[model samples]
Target: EEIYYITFREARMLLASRGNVKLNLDLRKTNRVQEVEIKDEGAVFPDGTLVEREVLEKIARDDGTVYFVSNGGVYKAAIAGESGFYKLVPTIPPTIEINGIAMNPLQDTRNKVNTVMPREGETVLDTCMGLGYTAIEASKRGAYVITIEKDPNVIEIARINPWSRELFTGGKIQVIQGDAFEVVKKFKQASFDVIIHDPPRFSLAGHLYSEEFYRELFRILKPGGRLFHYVGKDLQKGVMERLRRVGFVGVRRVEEALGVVARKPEK
Candidate 1:
Protein backbone atom coordinates (compact mmCIF):
# COMPACT_ATOMS: atom_id res chain seq x y z
CA GLU A 1 0.00 0.00 0.00
CA GLU A 2 1.20 3.51 -0.79
CA ILE A 3 1.03 6.44 1.63
CA TYR A 4 0.00 9.82 0.24
CA TYR A 5 2.42 12.19 2.01
CA ILE A 6 1.47 15.82 1.51
CA THR A 7 3.77 18.63 2.39
CA PHE A 8 2.37 22.16 2.76
CA ARG A 9 2.90 22.80 -0.94
CA GLU A 10 0.79 19.83 -2.02
CA ALA A 11 -1.82 20.55 0.64
CA ARG A 12 -2.19 24.14 -0.61
CA MET A 13 -2.79 22.87 -4.13
CA LEU A 14 -5.53 20.51 -2.97
CA LEU A 15 -7.15 23.31 -0.95
CA ALA A 16 -7.17 25.86 -3.79
CA SER A 17 -8.42 23.68 -6.62
CA ARG A 18 -10.68 20.81 -7.59
CA GLY A 19 -10.33 18.08 -10.20
CA ASN A 20 -7.07 16.34 -11.12
CA VAL A 21 -3.76 17.92 -10.05
CA LYS A 22 -0.37 16.66 -11.15
CA LEU A 23 1.96 16.34 -8.17
CA ASN A 24 4.91 14.53 -6.72
CA LEU A 25 3.08 11.91 -4.69
CA ASP A 26 6.09 9.64 -4.28
CA LEU A 27 8.67 11.44 -2.21
CA ARG A 28 11.48 9.27 -3.47
CA LYS A 29 10.44 10.03 -7.05
CA THR A 30 12.07 6.91 -8.39
CA ASN A 31 10.21 7.33 -11.65
CA ARG A 32 7.72 10.11 -12.58
CA VAL A 33 5.02 12.29 -11.08
CA GLN A 34 1.33 11.27 -10.78
CA GLU A 35 -2.12 12.88 -10.67
CA VAL A 36 -4.74 12.87 -7.91
CA GLU A 37 -8.30 14.10 -7.96
CA ILE A 38 -9.43 17.01 -5.77
CA LYS A 39 -13.16 16.58 -5.19
CA ASP A 40 -15.63 18.44 -2.97
CA GLU A 41 -15.20 15.76 -0.36
CA GLY A 42 -11.42 15.77 -0.41
CA ALA A 43 -8.35 14.89 -2.43
CA VAL A 44 -8.49 11.22 -3.40
CA PHE A 45 -5.25 9.44 -4.25
CA PRO A 46 -4.87 6.24 -6.18
CA ASP A 47 -3.90 4.52 -2.95
CA GLY A 48 -7.46 4.94 -1.58
CA THR A 49 -6.60 7.75 0.79
CA LEU A 50 -9.31 10.41 1.09
CA VAL A 51 -8.02 13.37 3.06
CA GLU A 52 -10.89 15.58 4.19
CA ARG A 53 -10.92 19.35 3.55
CA GLU A 54 -10.47 20.17 7.23
CA VAL A 55 -7.34 18.04 7.39
CA LEU A 56 -6.00 19.64 4.21
CA GLU A 57 -6.55 23.13 5.66
CA LYS A 58 -4.58 22.29 8.80
CA ILE A 59 -1.74 20.93 6.68
CA ALA A 60 -1.79 23.91 4.32
CA ARG A 61 -1.64 26.34 7.22
CA ASP A 62 1.69 25.11 8.51
CA ASP A 63 4.67 25.16 6.24
CA GLY A 64 6.60 22.89 8.58
CA THR A 65 3.95 20.22 8.91
CA VAL A 66 3.94 17.05 6.80
CA TYR A 67 0.86 14.86 6.88
CA PHE A 68 0.12 11.36 5.61
CA VAL A 69 -2.99 9.20 5.67
CA SER A 70 -2.35 5.53 6.18
CA ASN A 71 -4.70 2.54 6.36
CA GLY A 72 -5.42 3.96 9.82
CA GLY A 73 -6.16 7.57 10.82
CA VAL A 74 -4.30 10.49 9.35
CA TYR A 75 -1.07 11.33 11.15
CA LYS A 76 1.19 14.37 11.00
CA ALA A 77 4.91 13.87 10.56
CA ALA A 78 5.60 15.68 13.81
CA ILE A 79 5.09 14.50 17.39
CA ALA A 80 5.34 16.18 20.79
CA GLY A 81 8.29 15.18 22.93
CA GLU A 82 9.57 16.33 26.32
CA SER A 83 11.99 18.61 24.53
CA GLY A 84 9.33 19.94 22.16
CA PHE A 85 7.97 18.88 18.81
CA TYR A 86 9.98 16.43 16.73
CA LYS A 87 9.28 16.83 13.02
CA LEU A 88 10.51 14.57 10.25
CA VAL A 89 11.19 17.09 7.49
CA PRO A 90 11.03 16.10 3.83
CA THR A 91 14.77 16.20 3.24
CA ILE A 92 16.43 13.68 0.95
CA PRO A 93 17.06 11.20 3.76
CA PRO A 94 14.62 12.96 6.13
CA THR A 95 16.11 15.41 8.63
CA ILE A 96 14.63 15.63 12.13
CA GLU A 97 13.52 19.01 13.42
CA ILE A 98 13.99 19.25 17.19
CA ASN A 99 12.41 22.26 18.74
CA GLY A 100 13.27 24.63 15.87
CA ILE A 101 16.71 23.38 14.83
CA ALA A 102 16.95 21.11 11.82
CA MET A 103 19.40 18.29 11.25
CA ASN A 104 21.13 17.77 7.91
CA PRO A 105 19.86 14.23 7.61
CA LEU A 106 22.10 13.07 4.81
CA GLN A 107 25.38 14.84 5.55
CA ASP A 108 25.18 14.68 9.34
CA THR A 109 24.15 11.02 9.64
CA ARG A 110 26.77 10.02 7.11
CA ASN A 111 29.53 11.96 8.90
CA LYS A 112 28.61 10.60 12.34
CA VAL A 113 28.69 7.01 11.08
CA ASN A 114 31.86 7.53 9.11
CA THR A 115 33.65 9.12 12.06
CA VAL A 116 32.74 6.27 14.42
CA MET A 117 33.48 3.71 11.71
CA PRO A 118 31.52 0.78 13.15
CA ARG A 119 32.95 -2.38 11.67
CA GLU A 120 31.43 -5.68 10.62
CA GLY A 121 30.65 -8.09 13.53
CA GLU A 122 31.14 -5.34 16.10
CA THR A 123 28.54 -4.39 18.69
CA VAL A 124 27.49 -0.72 18.75
CA LEU A 125 25.78 1.32 21.43
CA ASP A 126 23.98 4.42 20.14
CA THR A 127 23.12 6.88 22.91
CA CYS A 128 20.46 8.65 20.88
CA MET A 129 18.05 7.02 18.45
CA GLY A 130 16.20 9.98 16.91
CA LEU A 131 15.04 8.41 13.66
CA GLY A 132 17.32 5.36 14.08
CA TYR A 133 19.17 6.38 10.93
CA THR A 134 22.49 6.21 12.73
CA ALA A 135 21.59 2.79 14.13
CA ILE A 136 20.49 1.58 10.72
CA GLU A 137 23.69 2.97 9.23
CA ALA A 138 25.73 1.03 11.78
CA SER A 139 23.65 -2.10 11.20
CA LYS A 140 24.30 -1.80 7.49
CA ARG A 141 28.01 -2.04 8.24
CA GLY A 142 27.19 -5.38 9.96
CA ALA A 143 27.36 -4.11 13.51
CA TYR A 144 24.50 -5.11 15.80
CA VAL A 145 22.97 -2.04 17.42
CA ILE A 146 21.57 -1.27 20.87
CA THR A 147 20.15 2.27 20.71
CA ILE A 148 18.51 4.17 23.56
CA GLU A 149 15.87 6.83 23.01
CA LYS A 150 14.73 8.71 26.14
CA ASP A 151 11.71 10.28 24.47
CA PRO A 152 8.62 8.19 23.69
CA ASN A 153 7.51 10.66 21.04
CA VAL A 154 10.76 10.13 19.15
CA ILE A 155 10.16 6.39 19.30
CA GLU A 156 6.59 6.83 18.05
CA ILE A 157 7.80 9.15 15.30
CA ALA A 158 10.31 6.55 14.18
CA ARG A 159 7.61 3.90 14.12
CA ILE A 160 5.53 6.06 11.78
CA ASN A 161 8.39 6.57 9.33
CA PRO A 162 8.70 4.20 6.39
CA TRP A 163 12.38 5.12 5.94
CA SER A 164 13.03 3.93 9.48
CA ARG A 165 11.66 0.47 8.71
CA GLU A 166 15.07 -1.15 9.13
CA LEU A 167 15.16 -0.13 12.76
CA PHE A 168 12.21 -2.50 13.28
CA THR A 169 12.53 -5.24 10.67
CA GLY A 170 16.28 -5.44 10.08
CA GLY A 171 16.82 -7.74 13.12
CA LYS A 172 20.13 -5.96 13.78
CA ILE A 173 18.82 -3.14 15.93
CA GLN A 174 17.51 -3.27 19.50
CA VAL A 175 15.77 -0.28 21.08
CA ILE A 176 15.89 0.51 24.80
CA GLN A 177 13.59 3.30 25.89
CA GLY A 178 14.95 5.25 28.90
CA ASP A 179 17.06 8.16 29.98
CA ALA A 180 20.61 7.45 28.82
CA PHE A 181 22.05 9.22 31.86
CA GLU A 182 20.56 6.43 34.00
CA VAL A 183 20.63 3.71 31.36
CA VAL A 184 24.45 3.75 30.96
CA LYS A 185 24.86 2.50 34.51
CA LYS A 186 23.08 -0.80 33.82
CA PHE A 187 25.57 -2.11 31.28
CA LYS A 188 28.50 -4.27 32.41
CA GLN A 189 32.08 -3.16 31.88
CA ALA A 190 33.54 -3.43 28.37
CA SER A 191 30.15 -4.03 26.74
CA PHE A 192 30.26 -2.30 23.40
CA ASP A 193 32.85 -2.32 20.64
CA VAL A 194 31.89 1.22 19.64
CA ILE A 195 29.74 3.95 21.13
CA ILE A 196 27.98 6.73 19.22
CA HIS A 197 26.91 9.36 21.78
CA ASP A 198 24.60 11.65 19.84
CA PRO A 199 23.00 13.37 22.80
CA PRO A 200 20.80 16.45 22.67
CA ARG A 201 22.49 19.84 22.87
CA PHE A 202 24.12 20.92 26.13
CA SER A 203 21.38 23.43 26.89
CA LEU A 204 18.65 20.82 26.51
CA ALA A 205 20.40 18.04 28.46
CA GLY A 206 23.29 19.35 30.53
CA HIS A 207 23.90 16.14 32.44
CA LEU A 208 24.93 14.31 29.25
CA TYR A 209 27.95 16.66 29.08
CA SER A 210 29.13 15.98 32.62
CA GLU A 211 32.29 14.03 33.46
CA GLU A 212 30.21 11.53 35.40
CA PHE A 213 28.40 10.39 32.24
CA TYR A 214 31.65 10.17 30.27
CA ARG A 215 33.15 7.85 32.88
CA GLU A 216 30.17 5.53 32.55
CA LEU A 217 30.56 5.59 28.78
CA PHE A 218 34.27 4.89 29.10
CA ARG A 219 33.61 1.97 31.45
CA ILE A 220 31.16 0.23 29.16
CA LEU A 221 33.40 0.51 26.11
CA LYS A 222 35.73 -2.43 25.49
CA PRO A 223 39.50 -1.86 25.57
CA GLY A 224 40.45 0.46 22.73
CA GLY A 225 36.85 0.80 21.56
CA ARG A 226 36.00 4.05 19.76
CA LEU A 227 33.37 6.59 20.82
CA PHE A 228 31.97 9.37 18.67
CA HIS A 229 29.96 11.98 20.56
CA TYR A 230 28.15 14.74 18.66
CA VAL A 231 28.38 18.13 20.33
CA GLY A 232 26.65 20.10 17.55
CA LYS A 233 27.31 23.88 17.64
CA ASP A 234 28.78 23.53 21.13
CA LEU A 235 32.44 24.44 21.44
CA GLN A 236 34.53 21.30 21.45
CA LYS A 237 37.60 23.07 22.83
CA GLY A 238 36.53 22.54 26.44
CA VAL A 239 34.46 19.39 25.84
CA MET A 240 37.50 17.61 24.40
CA GLU A 241 39.28 18.21 27.72
CA ARG A 242 36.31 16.61 29.57
CA LEU A 243 36.73 13.49 27.50
CA ARG A 244 40.37 13.46 28.56
CA ARG A 245 39.39 13.78 32.23
CA VAL A 246 37.11 10.74 31.91
CA GLY A 247 40.00 8.38 31.03
CA PHE A 248 39.51 8.65 27.30
CA VAL A 249 42.73 8.79 25.30
CA GLY A 250 43.28 10.11 21.79
CA VAL A 251 40.35 12.50 22.23
CA ARG A 252 39.92 14.70 19.20
CA ARG A 253 37.29 16.75 17.45
CA VAL A 254 35.48 15.38 14.41
CA GLU A 255 34.68 18.75 12.86
CA GLU A 256 33.00 17.46 9.72
CA ALA A 257 30.43 15.63 11.83
CA LEU A 258 30.20 18.43 14.42
CA GLY A 259 31.24 15.83 16.99
CA VAL A 260 34.19 14.55 19.03
CA VAL A 261 35.80 11.12 18.61
CA ALA A 262 38.03 9.33 21.11
CA ARG A 263 39.05 5.87 22.20
CA LYS A 264 39.21 3.98 25.52
CA PRO A 265 42.77 2.97 26.36
CA GLU A 266 43.94 -0.57 25.54
CA LYS A 267 43.97 -2.99 28.46
Candidate 2:
Protein backbone atom coordinates (compact mmCIF):
# COMPACT_ATOMS: atom_id res chain seq x y z
CA GLU A 1 0.00 0.00 0.00
CA GLU A 2 1.79 3.15 -1.25
CA ILE A 3 -0.44 6.17 -0.61
CA TYR A 4 -2.85 5.97 2.34
CA TYR A 5 -5.86 8.23 2.67
CA ILE A 6 -7.41 9.48 5.90
CA THR A 7 -9.40 12.41 7.23
CA PHE A 8 -8.13 14.72 9.95
CA ARG A 9 -10.30 12.95 12.53
CA GLU A 10 -9.01 9.50 11.67
CA ALA A 11 -5.44 10.74 11.77
CA ARG A 12 -5.94 12.33 15.17
CA MET A 13 -7.55 9.22 16.62
CA LEU A 14 -4.69 6.97 15.61
CA LEU A 15 -2.13 9.34 17.02
CA ALA A 16 -4.04 9.42 20.28
CA SER A 17 -4.54 5.71 20.81
CA ARG A 18 -1.01 4.52 19.94
CA GLY A 19 -2.42 0.99 20.18
CA ASN A 20 -1.20 -1.84 17.99
CA VAL A 21 1.33 0.71 16.75
CA LYS A 22 5.09 1.15 17.09
CA LEU A 23 6.64 4.51 17.89
CA ASN A 24 10.06 5.59 16.60
CA LEU A 25 10.97 6.21 20.22
CA ASP A 26 10.24 4.07 23.25
CA LEU A 27 7.32 6.17 24.50
CA ARG A 28 7.49 4.46 27.86
CA LYS A 29 11.18 5.15 28.62
CA THR A 30 11.99 8.12 26.39
CA ASN A 31 11.68 11.79 27.29
CA ARG A 32 8.18 12.50 26.02
CA VAL A 33 6.18 15.62 26.74
CA GLN A 34 3.58 14.46 29.25
CA GLU A 35 1.04 17.26 28.96
CA VAL A 36 0.00 16.87 25.33
CA GLU A 37 -3.21 15.08 24.37
CA ILE A 38 -4.72 14.19 20.97
CA LYS A 39 -8.32 14.62 22.11
CA ASP A 40 -7.51 18.28 22.54
CA GLU A 41 -6.78 18.38 18.83
CA GLY A 42 -10.41 17.50 18.06
CA ALA A 43 -9.78 13.76 18.12
CA VAL A 44 -12.65 11.55 19.21
CA PHE A 45 -10.91 9.30 21.70
CA PRO A 46 -13.42 6.62 22.56
CA ASP A 47 -10.76 4.88 24.73
CA GLY A 48 -7.05 4.02 25.48
CA THR A 49 -3.77 5.45 26.99
CA LEU A 50 -2.38 8.76 28.20
CA VAL A 51 -1.52 10.95 25.19
CA GLU A 52 -1.62 14.66 25.80
CA ARG A 53 -2.86 17.04 23.10
CA GLU A 54 0.30 19.05 22.40
CA VAL A 55 2.51 16.07 21.54
CA LEU A 56 -0.13 14.87 19.13
CA GLU A 57 -0.24 18.21 17.30
CA LYS A 58 3.53 18.37 16.94
CA ILE A 59 3.61 14.93 15.27
CA ALA A 60 0.63 15.59 13.02
CA ARG A 61 2.38 18.74 11.88
CA ASP A 62 5.49 16.80 10.93
CA ASP A 63 5.52 15.53 7.33
CA GLY A 64 6.44 11.92 8.19
CA THR A 65 2.88 11.17 9.29
CA VAL A 66 1.53 8.53 6.87
CA TYR A 67 -2.10 7.41 7.31
CA PHE A 68 -3.32 4.00 6.20
CA VAL A 69 -6.86 2.58 5.99
CA SER A 70 -6.71 -0.98 7.23
CA ASN A 71 -9.84 -3.02 8.03
CA GLY A 72 -11.89 0.22 7.92
CA GLY A 73 -9.90 2.20 10.51
CA VAL A 74 -6.85 4.36 9.78
CA TYR A 75 -3.41 4.34 11.43
CA LYS A 76 -0.32 6.57 11.35
CA ALA A 77 3.44 6.27 12.02
CA ALA A 78 5.95 9.03 12.66
CA ILE A 79 9.01 7.81 10.69
CA ALA A 80 11.98 9.90 11.92
CA GLY A 81 13.67 12.12 14.49
CA GLU A 82 16.12 11.60 17.39
CA SER A 83 14.62 8.16 17.88
CA GLY A 84 15.05 7.39 14.19
CA PHE A 85 18.50 8.93 13.58
CA TYR A 86 20.13 8.14 16.91
CA LYS A 87 18.23 4.99 17.88
CA LEU A 88 17.77 2.91 14.68
CA VAL A 89 14.06 2.16 15.07
CA PRO A 90 12.35 0.85 11.93
CA THR A 91 9.67 3.35 10.90
CA ILE A 92 6.50 1.33 10.56
CA PRO A 93 5.15 2.00 7.10
CA PRO A 94 8.59 3.59 6.67
CA THR A 95 7.77 6.83 4.91
CA ILE A 96 9.50 10.12 4.21
CA GLU A 97 7.96 13.22 2.70
CA ILE A 98 10.43 14.64 0.15
CA ASN A 99 9.76 18.33 -0.49
CA GLY A 100 6.03 17.96 0.29
CA ILE A 101 5.80 14.62 -1.51
CA ALA A 102 5.22 11.33 0.34
CA MET A 103 7.34 8.29 -0.52
CA ASN A 104 6.86 4.63 0.32
CA PRO A 105 9.33 2.85 2.64
CA LEU A 106 8.31 -0.64 1.60
CA GLN A 107 8.50 0.28 -2.07
CA ASP A 108 12.05 1.44 -1.53
CA THR A 109 12.73 -1.95 0.04
CA ARG A 110 11.30 -3.69 -3.03
CA ASN A 111 13.22 -1.74 -5.71
CA LYS A 112 16.74 -2.57 -4.61
CA VAL A 113 18.91 -5.02 -6.53
CA ASN A 114 20.66 -6.00 -3.32
CA THR A 115 18.01 -5.64 -0.55
CA VAL A 116 16.37 -8.43 1.50
CA MET A 117 12.60 -8.39 1.15
CA PRO A 118 9.12 -9.67 0.19
CA ARG A 119 10.33 -13.24 -0.24
CA GLU A 120 10.56 -15.83 2.54
CA GLY A 121 13.57 -17.11 4.51
CA GLU A 122 16.94 -17.05 2.79
CA THR A 123 20.21 -15.34 3.51
CA VAL A 124 19.96 -11.65 2.51
CA LEU A 125 22.40 -8.76 2.38
CA ASP A 126 21.39 -5.13 2.88
CA THR A 127 24.36 -2.91 1.98
CA CYS A 128 23.10 0.40 3.37
CA MET A 129 20.91 -0.12 6.41
CA GLY A 130 19.60 3.39 7.12
CA LEU A 131 17.36 3.25 10.19
CA GLY A 132 17.48 -0.48 9.40
CA TYR A 133 14.34 0.02 7.32
CA THR A 134 15.02 -2.59 4.66
CA ALA A 135 16.45 -4.99 7.19
CA ILE A 136 13.40 -4.78 9.46
CA GLU A 137 10.96 -5.16 6.60
CA ALA A 138 12.82 -8.19 5.25
CA SER A 139 13.04 -9.82 8.65
CA LYS A 140 9.31 -9.36 9.30
CA ARG A 141 8.70 -11.06 6.00
CA GLY A 142 10.85 -13.93 7.37
CA ALA A 143 14.50 -13.81 6.26
CA TYR A 144 17.89 -13.37 7.84
CA VAL A 145 19.39 -9.96 7.01
CA ILE A 146 23.06 -9.12 7.13
CA THR A 147 22.85 -5.33 6.97
CA ILE A 148 25.65 -2.76 6.77
CA GLU A 149 25.63 0.98 7.26
CA LYS A 150 28.50 3.48 7.45
CA ASP A 151 26.79 6.27 9.37
CA PRO A 152 27.18 6.20 13.14
CA ASN A 153 24.00 8.18 13.72
CA VAL A 154 21.85 5.65 11.87
CA ILE A 155 23.42 2.73 13.74
CA GLU A 156 22.45 4.24 17.05
CA ILE A 157 18.88 4.70 15.86
CA ALA A 158 18.80 1.02 14.81
CA ARG A 159 19.44 0.13 18.44
CA ILE A 160 16.11 1.82 19.17
CA ASN A 161 14.19 0.45 16.22
CA PRO A 162 11.85 -2.12 17.79
CA TRP A 163 12.06 -4.34 14.73
CA SER A 164 15.86 -4.44 14.66
CA ARG A 165 16.02 -5.30 18.35
CA GLU A 166 13.38 -7.92 17.71
CA LEU A 167 15.86 -9.53 15.31
CA PHE A 168 18.24 -10.16 18.20
CA THR A 169 15.44 -11.78 20.22
CA GLY A 170 14.82 -14.11 17.24
CA GLY A 171 18.40 -14.24 15.95
CA LYS A 172 17.48 -13.07 12.44
CA ILE A 173 19.70 -10.07 11.68
CA GLN A 174 23.46 -9.41 11.81
CA VAL A 175 24.53 -5.78 11.76
CA ILE A 176 27.93 -4.34 10.93
CA GLN A 177 29.16 -0.79 10.79
CA GLY A 178 31.65 -0.23 7.93
CA ASP A 179 32.20 0.43 4.26
CA ALA A 180 29.94 -1.90 2.24
CA PHE A 181 32.18 -2.33 -0.77
CA GLU A 182 35.23 -3.25 1.28
CA VAL A 183 33.22 -5.55 3.52
CA VAL A 184 31.56 -7.26 0.57
CA LYS A 185 34.85 -8.34 -1.02
CA LYS A 186 35.59 -10.56 1.98
CA PHE A 187 32.35 -12.55 1.59
CA LYS A 188 32.42 -15.93 -0.23
CA GLN A 189 30.70 -16.77 -3.50
CA ALA A 190 27.05 -17.87 -3.57
CA SER A 191 26.75 -17.11 0.11
CA PHE A 192 23.57 -15.02 0.00
CA ASP A 193 20.06 -15.62 -1.24
CA VAL A 194 19.49 -11.92 -2.01
CA ILE A 195 21.50 -8.71 -2.17
CA ILE A 196 20.00 -5.27 -1.50
CA HIS A 197 22.01 -2.33 -2.85
CA ASP A 198 20.74 1.11 -1.78
CA PRO A 199 24.00 2.97 -1.69
CA PRO A 200 24.38 6.71 -1.91
CA ARG A 201 24.57 8.10 -5.42
CA PHE A 202 27.84 9.69 -4.43
CA SER A 203 30.83 7.78 -2.93
CA LEU A 204 32.03 4.16 -3.47
CA ALA A 205 28.52 3.19 -4.51
CA GLY A 206 29.22 5.26 -7.58
CA HIS A 207 31.50 2.37 -8.50
CA LEU A 208 28.89 -0.26 -7.54
CA TYR A 209 26.99 0.20 -10.79
CA SER A 210 30.16 -0.66 -12.69
CA GLU A 211 30.88 -4.10 -14.14
CA GLU A 212 33.36 -4.84 -11.38
CA PHE A 213 30.80 -4.35 -8.61
CA TYR A 214 28.22 -6.36 -10.52
CA ARG A 215 30.72 -9.21 -10.72
CA GLU A 216 31.07 -9.28 -6.96
CA LEU A 217 27.30 -9.10 -6.54
CA PHE A 218 26.81 -12.06 -8.85
CA ARG A 219 29.55 -14.08 -7.21
CA ILE A 220 27.89 -13.70 -3.82
CA LEU A 221 24.48 -14.90 -4.99
CA LYS A 222 23.59 -18.60 -5.00
CA PRO A 223 22.75 -19.75 -8.58
CA GLY A 224 19.00 -19.11 -8.14
CA GLY A 225 19.27 -16.17 -5.78
CA ARG A 226 18.29 -12.56 -6.62
CA LEU A 227 19.52 -8.95 -6.68
CA PHE A 228 17.47 -5.79 -6.01
CA HIS A 229 19.34 -2.55 -6.68
CA TYR A 230 17.96 0.87 -5.90
CA VAL A 231 19.09 2.94 -8.90
CA GLY A 232 17.83 6.08 -7.33
CA LYS A 233 18.50 9.60 -8.63
CA ASP A 234 20.42 10.42 -11.86
CA LEU A 235 19.86 6.99 -13.33
CA GLN A 236 23.11 5.44 -14.51
CA LYS A 237 23.14 4.02 -18.02
CA GLY A 238 25.77 1.34 -17.54
CA VAL A 239 24.07 -0.37 -14.59
CA MET A 240 22.08 -2.79 -16.70
CA GLU A 241 24.86 -3.35 -19.18
CA ARG A 242 27.25 -4.24 -16.36
CA LEU A 243 24.72 -6.62 -14.82
CA ARG A 244 24.46 -8.35 -18.19
CA ARG A 245 28.22 -8.52 -18.51
CA VAL A 246 28.31 -10.27 -15.15
CA GLY A 247 25.76 -12.84 -16.43
CA PHE A 248 22.79 -11.60 -14.33
CA VAL A 249 19.85 -12.55 -16.51
CA GLY A 250 16.15 -11.60 -16.64
CA VAL A 251 16.86 -7.91 -16.30
CA ARG A 252 13.75 -5.81 -15.71
CA ARG A 253 13.08 -2.19 -14.73
CA VAL A 254 10.40 -0.76 -12.43
CA GLU A 255 10.11 2.94 -11.60
CA GLU A 256 8.70 4.86 -8.65
CA ALA A 257 8.55 8.64 -8.26
CA LEU A 258 11.97 8.94 -6.57
CA GLY A 259 13.95 5.91 -7.88
CA VAL A 260 14.09 2.68 -9.85
CA VAL A 261 14.76 -1.05 -9.19
CA ALA A 262 16.43 -3.78 -11.26
CA ARG A 263 16.14 -7.52 -10.65
CA LYS A 264 18.57 -10.36 -11.42
CA PRO A 265 17.50 -13.65 -12.94
CA GLU A 266 17.02 -16.55 -10.56
CA LYS A 267 19.63 -18.99 -11.93
- Largest lDDT belongs to which candidate? 1
Runs in model 2 lying further than 4 Å from the true structure = 1-103, 106-118, 167-170, 202-204, 256-266
* Positional deviation of residue 239's Cα in model 2 after best superposition, in angstroms: 0.7
Tens digits of per-residue lDDT, candidate 1, 41-153, equal 88887776788888888878877756776775677788775659788776665567778764565657878999878988899999989889899888889899999998787
Q: All candidates' TM-scores?
A: 0.82, 0.59
Across 95-136, the per-residue lDDT of candidate 2 in tens digits comes to 333222226555555444233244665888888876666776
In candidate 2, position 137 carries an lDDT of: 70
Runs off by more than 4 Å, candidate 1: 13-35, 38-41, 52-54, 78-104, 233-235
